[PDB]
RNA sequence: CUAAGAAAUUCACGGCGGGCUUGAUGUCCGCGUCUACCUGGUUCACUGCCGUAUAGGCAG
């Protein structure tokens, strides 16, 4: 939008696709989760759904000051020695449809869905008939894993973004702040 | 377009009485199993969820 950023994670053993570098792709958004910051546009610049990975670099869409000096949260650590590092730049001057990043798009509703199936004062024999498992179905959400209390290794993810605009502006805010609808950088 | 072409074996029955298998025995003796290794390929496509409705500070 106003200042699009990137973060290069270098290749190594510890950043392979198993659990040292698989789970740090859709759950490591501590700059928009824990390290400080909540009003950015999530726009991953590696949206290639063939490998099920909607982001290659650490693509983030922010403003001019938020990309130049207002993006110093702890959500960019590990790239000091175990990877490379990025910096801020200008926003998309052309019309890039980069309204897709790590956002609140995901289909893991079976983690707590017994209240929507059989926790409504009934027994447990209606966990798929009254309220089905159709929302707790894993699908091809192109997005890196997550490292929360769901497995010792990484997890699943998704891309909660859509189209992008033609001007320079941060779009709408989802759970991950995925800046869909705003003209972020296309890649 | 075939060693082609076709076809109901059925009904009924008491197997049964008896038995001492015993005696004795030295398995001995000897040995090098070593050498290396990422389980971070999710132990529920998940552990709690507002409406099963890709609805999330989702605890990611």
UniProtKB/Swiss-Prot annotation:
Keyword annotations from UniProtKB, A to Z: Antiviral defense, Endonuclease, Hydrolase, Nuclease, RNA-binding
InterPro entries noted in UniProt: CRISPR-assoc_prot_Csy4 (IPR013396), CRISPR-Cas6/Csy4_sf (IPR042564)
Signal peptide bounds: none
Enzyme Commission number(s) of this protein: 3.1.-.-
Inactivation phenotype: Infection with phage DMS3 inhibits biofilm formation; disrupting this gene restores biofilm formation despite DMS3 infection. Normal biofilm formation in the absence of phage infection. Loss of production of crRNA in the presence or absence of phage. Disruption of the entire Y.pestis-subtype CRISPR region disrupts crRNA production but does not alter phage resistance (possibly OLNs PA14_33350 to PA14_33310, plus the flanking CRISPR loci), indicating this CRISPR is not involved in phage resistance.
EC class name: hydrolase
GO molecular function: endonuclease activity; RNA binding
The keyword DNA repair appears for this protein: no
Keyword Transmembrane helix assigned: no
Top-level taxon in the UniProt lineage: Bacteria
Active-site feature positions: 29
Known outcome of mutating residue 104 to A: No loss of pre-crRNA cleavage, still binds crRNA
Note: In this bacteria, Y.pestis-subtype CRISPRs do not confer resistance to phage DMS3 or MP22, but instead are required for DMS3-dependent inhibition of biofilm formation and possibly motility.
Protein name: CRISPR-associated endonuclease Cas6/Csy4
Organism: Pseudomonas aeruginosa (strain UCBPP-PA14)
Name of encoding gene: cas6f
